Amino acid sequence: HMMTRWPSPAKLNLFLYITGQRADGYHTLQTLFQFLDYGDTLTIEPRTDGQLRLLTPVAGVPDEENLIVRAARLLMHAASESDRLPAGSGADISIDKRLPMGGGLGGGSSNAATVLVALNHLWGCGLSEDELATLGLQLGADVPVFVRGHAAFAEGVGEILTPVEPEEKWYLVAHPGVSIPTPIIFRDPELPRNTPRRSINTLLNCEFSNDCELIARKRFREVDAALSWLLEYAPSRLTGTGACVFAEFNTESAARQVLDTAPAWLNGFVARGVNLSPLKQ
Template sequence: MTAITADAELILPAPAKLNLMLHILGRREDGYHELQTLFQFLDHGDELGFAVRQDGQIRLHSAVPGVPHDSNLIVRAARSLQEASGTRLGADIWLDKRLPMGGGIGGGSSDAATTLVGLDHLWDTRLGEDRLAELGLRLGADVPVFVRGRAAFAEGVGERLQPVTLEEPWFLVAVPQVFVSTAEIFSDPELTRDTPPIKVRSLLEGGGRNDCQPVVEKRYPEVHNALILLNKFVSARLTGTGACIFGSFPNRADADKVARQLPGSLPSFVAQGRNISMLHRKLQARAKK
């Protein structure tokens, strides 16, 4: 992927997330699903660079295979901010893509959120977090949690967020080499859609599962086999609709030790869970200078 050029005026992270649990409560009349999930960020992700243009054009200089320029969530996020704010400024944008597509760790949604937050800062549009989250929701259900940047218990389609403080363990995230279609999983007739709602307090005391996991395992043997393998070392589960799977560890050394025992055919990375996203940490540090 294209490296971020020295022309970038602002370089920001677009962190990964994990769904530590994901319950499907039912299907709404509009086709979306009511769910409950627990989001936590990782200190690992994509990186974006931004520079202001005076001609109003939005140009993403890093091509993403299979995604046309104007369909990319980054470009759509930038244009939605332009429209909402009325600014005449544009942007050159560069993407250093590190997160897998179709992995369930929020790559595209996080890129879109970093674009909204970053350009709101660079263009000085000052729309505020609530408005940016509203714009983000139009782009995808996971975008608002990245805009707000705090670990959260989410309800609705994932847009009703209640900040939570979680332990920040180390995670080993394995990346089966398949692209999982979220729409395909949510339309599967075998998906559990009647899990009873739970309170965040009982969730934080332990429990929860991923209702999408049985469907994904059945459809994608690569995910099923990776879970069998990782479960030999640690309790493993799917994040989102996958394909990525994860297990938690009390320290980095333990996570690294297991990572070294995984086969080369199953790529992985180790990262720490974060209750405040690396995007917001970077902007807070920048504001203090």
């Protein structure tokens, strides 16, 4: 059927603090998200024969393990159980994938968010933003931020989101070459897990930092190298659990100038921060 095109932007954690750990191992976080005007593009063609096909498998991820497919299947389940899924609802999905796996840019969660929002719209299920954010939290920690579509402060177990208006700066984002899946960092015994809970105003007045950065820097020489390079030019930090690091600039020209200083083995891009997700249109 029709071929629809849907943005899946990256995010940055402008700061990220680990305030505690539950007995089941889950870490409570206080973190501030901003989107980038940069990321993946999904093409979604709806179907009436009930089939769900990923036309562009992502290397390193079996099909049924792709968050694209998991998101579609979860929406189908939730909508069907509430009598909101038309019979034969299906989709063919392809992705122009720019965001790396294990990058800390939230590519997987962003893909899931876009698929939830796009298929809910196309199939006409009528699920609210609240309902899609509740589904999204089951798929990925940051799916709710992408679903709701606003730069936001996230606490609780990731479901408490408050809109914030951080400066829409220009960022140089580097991929230091290695992939660091979040569990590799969150299982580290030396990870900080006792940063004090702070109000949003207090956090906005703190020195922005990422509690994962010291661990990633020490465990991965590639992250240390990328951070050492960018820090010669601008405030620079890890995003997510890495491996990606970013540097902040006041202008596009300055960011692209510093990107030009990048060693050839350090892939990077320049993108502006945006507080409204392209997905929200």
